[model samples]
Target: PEFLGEEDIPREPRRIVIHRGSTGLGFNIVGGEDGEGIFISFILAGGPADLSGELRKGDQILSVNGVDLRNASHEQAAIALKNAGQTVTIIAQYKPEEYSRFEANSRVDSSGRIVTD
Candidate 1:
């Protein structure tokens, strides 16, 4: 697939190992706008995902533990992530242009505050 005027973006799979009884992935995710897919909303510092340093904001989550998440609802995606248990592998895609529309309508103030209206 073409991305941002580039062709055939890589679909490199990334894994995050979450130890049992540990905190979560340290990131917040939301379903794709209009049900396009699931995308990472934010990654908290020092979290499992952040520690991995592979997953990033705006990365589209393709699947969790072999389960496809395309067009999944927020609840479904959350459940899948929860069900992943300890050692979870996630297939994701980094496509900045996919979220350009959102950024276009949002602005960051001098104080580094994101305002959407």
Candidate 2:
């Protein structure tokens, strides 16, 4: 695969641990979906990751349980996000100084389900 241009926003890496709900990890992974950097694309508002009020869309995931997503396969973060037991510690970052439209990257449609390739 070819290298994609890195986005311009760099955030102060944050350490947050979210407990899984009955559904799943409560968020969808994007960016690296098509192969770039792994990012939190869409969020389930009432889910565990949401109710905790920390992680949000556009936030780039740096690692999961200390596994680096920067160099690992894109699915690394995807699988780690889902398979890291009930309590998962995700270290991620987002540019607080930047804002842009992100609802189309990998968003939920009118059907309220994930949009995929």
Candidate 3:
């Protein structure tokens, strides 16, 4: 029902799902219901953010290099992350299923984006 990397995504079975926890895959942002976006609560490692430790689920992103994200939208946060270097300290919550969703698919896109059809 699962493999390690994108190359390992099953071909048949006519039923498969993709998420952050698949094999060695690190993070995932599966589509969620309306207004069901992620709600970061605190920070743990901020791996890519601070380029030190691994950021865990539910780590509420407090700021991007001191830029408060308390009132920032997802688009804004994404822009900040893009601007921030590969080592920006991020504060996030650790609730794994905070912004997660379920998908049934047997294949994925080149970027590992799931496609259920």
- lDDT for each residue of candidate 1 in 35-108, tens digit (9 for 90 to 100): 77887878888888887777776677888888888788888988888888877788887654554345546554
Per-residue lDDT tens digits for candidate 3, residues 1-117, read 554444532222121111222122223232223434434322334322223334533333546566766566667766765665544554444333332233333343464433447
What lDDT does each candidate get? 0.69, 0.66, 0.41
- In candidate 1, stretches whose alpha carbon ends up further than 4 angstroms from where it belongs are 1-21, 32-34, 103-117
Candidate 1's TM-score: 0.70
* Preferred candidate (TM-score higher): 1 or 3: 1
Error of 1 at 46 (Å): 0.4
Top candidate when judged by lDDT against the true structure = 1
Please identify model 2 stretches exceeding 4 Å from their true place: 1-10, 33-35, 96-117
* Candidates 2 and 3, the one with greater lDDT: 2
Per-residue lDDT tens digits for candidate 2, residues 18-40, read: 88857787888655544457767
Candidate 2, RMSD to the unseen true structure: 10.7
